[PDB]
Amino acid sequence: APQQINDIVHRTITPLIEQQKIPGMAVAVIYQGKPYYFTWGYADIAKKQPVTQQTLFELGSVSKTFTGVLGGDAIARGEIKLSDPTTKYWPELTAKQWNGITLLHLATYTAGGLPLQVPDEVKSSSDLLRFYQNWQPAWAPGTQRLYANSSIGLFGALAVKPSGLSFEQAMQTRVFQPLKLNHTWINVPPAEEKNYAWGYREGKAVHVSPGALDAEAYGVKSTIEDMARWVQSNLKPLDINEKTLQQGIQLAQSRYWQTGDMYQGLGWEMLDWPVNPDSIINGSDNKIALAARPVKAITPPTPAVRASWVHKTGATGGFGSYVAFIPEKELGIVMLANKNYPNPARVDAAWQILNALQ
Ligand SMILES: *[B]([O])([O])C1=[C]N(C2=[C]C(Cl)=N[C]=N2)N=[C]1
């Protein structure tokens, strides 16, 4: 890398790893559209395996950006509409509270208080039906945002129904393959296990456990190289050859709802650039990000704004991830770590790096 990129990345990330006691970390900076990679520490402390550019990390809720884009592609294919009722794709969902709740509301956490987690008790497809049939909204649809796996996860499951493909097969064929993300997995294959980092929670080595709607809400694993290519594709969608995927990317960065200075996309969240660093840093703390907040509809949604800070945090029990990019500047960053450390620290580091390069 250019010395300037090397210096800022090292000066920011080294103290971060020390302060947060992060075992292993990988970072990619996309600068003028080209990726530069950095790695530190251990993918597996016990076995002394270093983090490399091929190490797989659990992306946690950064997975929601893939779900958002896959749903976008399904809209662009004419398979689904965001204005369609949820019941069009799940006719057994007959309970009356669902009248008025559309795929838009599911994709954007605005259905009226679907919960952050699907209950652990829910396993089977019939367990899921019963959970959604019995769920009671706190609020009318399209009035309040409450970030929720049970919301976007159901969107991802329904979005692929008309294709007839399983969610994983759809993601593989329609998103990962066309973008050449050949080391990004919903289920890590045996051949790639040697590269799968452990996560660390309270000093214990851990991987994510199976759960309902896991693939759709938090289940993607990827390397720093593939995540850089993910950022390049979302920075410059018009260079993607597959037409519906190009559109699906653009649709996922449309602005559907506003709360404070943030806009809700499909998976992605966006703010006008230049941003107030306090606004994104403080806003990323779970005390704000997981809170129930009134939303203003953006009628109609604003198509992808190039002058935006587009981002998503992600975590699992043992991993912490962050992606941000600014289309107008051809600039972005991916940070993957195998410890779940506080969101504001991630965002502070990313802003320090991107602000210095912008
Ligand atoms: B996301 O905000 O990172 C996210 C991840 N999870 C989650 C849930 C379960 Cl049961 N297991 C791992 N991760 N929820 C939200």
UniProtKB/Swiss-Prot annotation:
GO terms for cellular component: outer membrane-bounded periplasmic space. Changing T67I: Increases activity about 200-fold with respect to cefotaxime. Reduces activity about 8-fold with respect to cephalothin. Reduces thermodynamic stability. Its EC number is 3.5.2.6. Changing E216K: Increases activity about 150-fold with respect to cefotaxime. Reduces activity about 5-fold with respect to cephalothin. Reduces thermodynamic stability. Changing L290A: Reduces binding affinity of inhibitor compound 3 about 30-fold. Its main location: periplasm. It catalyses: a beta-lactam + H2O = a substituted beta-amino acid. It is found in: Periplasm. Induction: Can be induced by beta-lactams. Expression is not up-regulated by the non-beta-lactam inhibitor, benzo(b)thiophene-2-boronic acid (BZBTH2B). GO terms for molecular function: beta-lactamase activity. The active site is at S61. Inhibited by the beta-lactamase-blocking agents avibactam, enmetazobactam, relebactam, nacubactam, vaborbactam, taniborbactam, zidebactam, and beta-lactam-analog boronic acids, via a covalent binding to Ser-61. Inhibited by non-beta-lactam, benzo(b)thiophene-2-boronic acid (BZBTH2B) and various cyclic boronates. Not inhibited by clavulanic acid. Inhibited by O-aryloxycarbonyl hydroxamates, via cross-linking of the active site Ser-61 to Lys-312. Weakly inhibited by citric acid. Keywords: Antibiotic resistance, Hydrolase, Periplasm, Signal. The keyword Coiled coil does not apply. Class C beta-lactamase which confers resistance to penicillins and cephalosporins. Has benzylpenicillin- and cephaloridine-hydrolyzing activity. Has weak cefuroxime, cefotaxime, cefoxitin and oxacillin-hydrolyzing activities. Belongs to the class-C beta-lactamase family. Monomer. This is Beta-lactamase. It comes from Escherichia coli (strain K12). The lineage of its organism: Bacteria, Pseudomonadati, Pseudomonadota, Gammaproteobacteria, Enterobacterales.
